[PDB]
Structure 1
Amino acid sequence: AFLHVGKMGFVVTMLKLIQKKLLDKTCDQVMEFSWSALWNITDETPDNCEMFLNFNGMKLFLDCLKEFPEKQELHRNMLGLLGNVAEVKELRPQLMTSQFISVFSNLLESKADGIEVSYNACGVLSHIMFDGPEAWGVCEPQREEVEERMWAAIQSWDINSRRNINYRSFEPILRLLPQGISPVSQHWATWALYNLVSVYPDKYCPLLIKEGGMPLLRDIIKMATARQETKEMARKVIEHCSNF
């Protein structure tokens, strides 16, 4: 258990501490904990994502990225937090700026913490791209260029990567499967499931099955808008889950 984050204003407490550490130019264990705490308290918790944005958290994120460009765990934790923010459809419009899209697109090539920074940045963009081209009112980083960078990132990851992430539910990922608005978001989501059932089948195969992932992946194989590579990946995900 933990305290009541809303009543205690814990999101604000963390962001104030991050601001103090950033001014002292220190990325120590306390700085990294503060971001790790924000990542963890925003999991499936939109009110905490909303409070992060309303307390100017995006500015602290960008300033920390620039002041600490080689701090890999810091980058992982910050991008995990933003991955949770990006799952909230009502908050995504706040991510649709050239400043923010450029950062996420640039992080697709990050080699920090193995694949975690690239993966979480691709997740952020996958939820953004799911809203369709009308939602992309940003002129610089063109949508098609970011999309091609997302395909490049996904294909570059080792499918047997061990991972510094966990999911209590696959529902935000599964929501990217039954749609043709954004094939790249569907491909990211299929890769996410494939990697997890490949490397951690005992935890993630039962999770994927219980939440209805199998019919969703079968539908991908029959889906006109899905790319050949996504259909091939989806059949293999079914493959490992049936063995289970």
Structure 2
Amino acid sequence: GYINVGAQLGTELFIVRQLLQIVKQKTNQNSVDTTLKFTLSALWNLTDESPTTCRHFIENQGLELFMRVLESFPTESSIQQKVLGLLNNIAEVQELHSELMWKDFIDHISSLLHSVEVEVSYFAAGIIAHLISRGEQAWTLSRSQRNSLLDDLHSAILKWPTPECEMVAYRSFNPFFPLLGCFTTPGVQLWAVWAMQHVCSKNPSRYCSMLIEEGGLQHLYNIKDHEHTDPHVQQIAVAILDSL
């Protein structure tokens, strides 16, 4: 039994609200506890493929709470991966795009995009890739930054070694397929195919089939035979292809 029809949703957004509180007290205490990392992980996981959870996160001042954990724990890369991992999930939500066009934010993840630790800059890239993928009209901050970041995206990826373990898990590749078509912005394209290549080669049982069943092959073959394609994007896309 449960309390009333339609009440499970309110319970989940309440849980979000309480987790964010635990984040706010751990940050006031400057206390990098296991409870705090458990909490950032819970938030991260609850925003996976949940625009509703993501919008609740934004409306409870989450974006500013998290800019503040990034500034309070500058040397904590585990904390930085979970923060940015969630912000990557937010970045996937189109209607939340304007909410992320804040300058203290872009400027911060833009710093993290140049972290040499792929477990941190992979998600900073994901955020940026998703935002740029809208671009033109949608970019309401420094048009020089968008054009700058588009090059920093493309070049940070080239430097990335392959990760030790899996840094991330996906239930679906659908949020990547819009990126795959962004020929005019090759770093956007390059993060998506790099992302796909990474998870497929670490755990092909789960992901190679997922990739094929959601039509990913179509998109990858589409990059390949659209031969006016960035060569680094072509490189990875044909490497994902000849592996299936």
TM-score of the two chains, using structure 1 as the length reference: 0.91
The whole-number CA distance in structure 2 between the counterparts of 1:26 and 1:141 is: 38
Give the drift of 1:181.
4.5
The share of aligned pairs that are identical, in percent, is 34
Which secondary structure state, in structure 1, belongs to the residue aligned with residue 111 of structure 2? helix
Which secondary structure state, in structure 2, belongs to the residue aligned with residue 110 of structure 1? coil
Note the 1:83-232 alignment, pairs <5 A: 83-111=88-116, 114-139=117-142, 142-159=145-162, 161-223=164-226, 226-232=229-235
Q: Find the counterpart in structure 1 of residue 71 from structure 2.
A: 66
The whole-number CA distance in structure 1 between the counterparts of 2:234 and 2:147 is: 22
Q: Does 1:6 align with 2:10?
A: yes
Kept in 1: contact 2:183–2:230 (CA 8 A): no
* One of 41, 48, 66 as aligned partner of 2:46: 41
In structure 2, list runs of 5 or more residues that go unmatched.
1-6
Give the drift of 1:116.
1.9
Q: Find the counterpart in structure 2 of residue 239 from structure 1.
A: 242
Read off the aligned partner of 1:67 and give its amino acid letter.
Answer: S
Give the drift of 1:93.
1.0
Give the drift of 1:97.
1.9
Q: Find the counterpart in structure 1 of residue 20 from structure 2.
A: 15
Read off the aligned partner of 1:117 and give its amino acid letter.
Answer: V
Kept in 2: contact 1:161–1:199 (CA 8 A): no
The whole-number CA distance in structure 2 between the counterparts of 1:119 and 1:7 is: 32
Query: In the superposition, relative to structure 1, how do residues 140 and 216 fare at CA in structure 2: closer, same or farther (>3 Å)?
Result: closer
Kept in 1: contact 2:118–2:163 (CA 8 A): no
Give the drift of 1:159.
3.5
Which secondary structure state, in structure 2, belongs to the residue aligned with residue 188 of structure 1? helix
The whole-number CA distance in structure 2 between the counterparts of 1:225 and 1:88 is: 29
Please give the root-mean-square deviation of Cα atoms over the aligned residues, in Å: 1.8
Per-residue CA deviation, residues 109-152 of structure 1 (Å, 9 max, x unaligned), is: 124xx412101111111110111222112127621211111112
TM-score of the two chains, using structure 2 as the length reference: 0.91
Per-residue CA deviation, residues 62-121 of structure 1 (Å, 9 max, x unaligned), is: 11111111111111110111011010000011111221111111110124xx41210111
The whole-number CA distance in structure 2 between the counterparts of 1:6 and 1:169 is: 25
